[PDB]
Write a structure and sequence with these properties.
Belongs to the alpha-carbonic anhydrase family. By secondary structure, the protein is mainly beta. The chain has helices spanning about 125-130, 155, 215-220, and strands at about 30, 35, 45, 55-60, 65, 75-80, 85-95, 105, 115-120, 135-145, 170, 185-190, 205-210, 210-215, 255. Strands 2, 3, 4, 5, 6, 7, 9, 10, 11, 12, 13, 14 and 15 form a 13-stranded mixed sheet that branches. Bound molecules: zinc ion.
């Protein structure tokens, strides 16, 4: 079983998942001195007014908030994307301390956490079909910068004590994902991958320029989750981030000057 420990962590994933050394792996470092403004890039259209959250789950690697994805209600369009992508889940990556935790970096800067809002391309019918395609997913990556407490996160923080160990889940209705968005939707974009095994190269990454805030106390609550399940030794869920991978032949485009 892959994980984030010394023995089963990112450095070793290529043994069981050889695509880990592929041509379009994520995350990447975003060099603002080389990412090119593309004035043709469209504004992002985020339509979450009618999103329906359902549950929250500790999967042993992160926690996921799952949404109903039966209809074109909660959707991402525009930006670099063709067509409509439905929100299916979001999750976070975070550190053992406030100085690290993000997967993407900006000029090598690491944030305390990173939010991934995962969407799939409706041209492919469902998530499982979409992940087999290079344009199957669109993921909105949002940095969390330590500062003031974020009221948009509080409902998540307040439920985490009910999903402490792997396999636990809880009902989680009426969560508004709009509260996790920054004011500006300026972004960088590039083609990449899932950041966990199976590391499939099926993602259009859309990384927002503006972080959202998080208080130190809020991100300390993430660290009270555990990677392990029942009967396994206790292992705090911290440093569940993959480090940046080679950009190779790819171009990171900026939507903003
Ligand atoms: Zn992720």
């Amino acid at each position: 079983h892959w994980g984030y420990g010394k023995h089963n962590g990112p450095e070793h994933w290529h043994k069981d998942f050889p695509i880990a050394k592929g041509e379009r792996q994520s995350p990447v470092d975003i060099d603002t001195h080389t990412a090119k403004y593309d004035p043709s890039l469209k504004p992002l259209s985020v339509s979450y007014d009618q999103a329906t959250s359902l549950r929250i789950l500790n999967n042993g690697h992160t926690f996921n908030v799952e949404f109903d994805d039966s209809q074109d209600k909660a959707v991402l369009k525009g930006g670099p994307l063709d067509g409509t992508y439905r929100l299916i889940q979001f999750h976070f990556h975070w550190g053992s301390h406030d100085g690290q935790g993000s997967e993407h970096t900006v000029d090598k800067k690491k944030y305390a956490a990173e939010l991934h809002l995962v969407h799939w391309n409706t041209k492919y019918g469902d998530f499982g079909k979409a992940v087999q395609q290079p344009d199957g997913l669109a993921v909105l990556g949002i940095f969390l910068k330590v500062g003031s407490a974020n009221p948009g996160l509080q409902k998540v923080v307040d439920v985490l004590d009910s999903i402490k160990t792997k396999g636990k889940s809880a009902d989680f209705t009426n969560f508004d994902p709009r509260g996790l968005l920054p004011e500006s939707l300026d972004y960088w974009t590039y083609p990449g991958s899932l950041t966990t095994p199976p590391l499939l190269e099926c993602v259009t990454w859309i990384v927002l320029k503006e972080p959202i805030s998080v208080s130190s106390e809020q991100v300390s609550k993430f660290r009270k989750l555990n990677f392990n399940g029942f009967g396994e030794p206790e292992e705090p869920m911290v440093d569940n981030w993959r480090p940046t991978q080679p950009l190779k032949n790819r171009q990171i485009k900026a939507s903003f000057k």
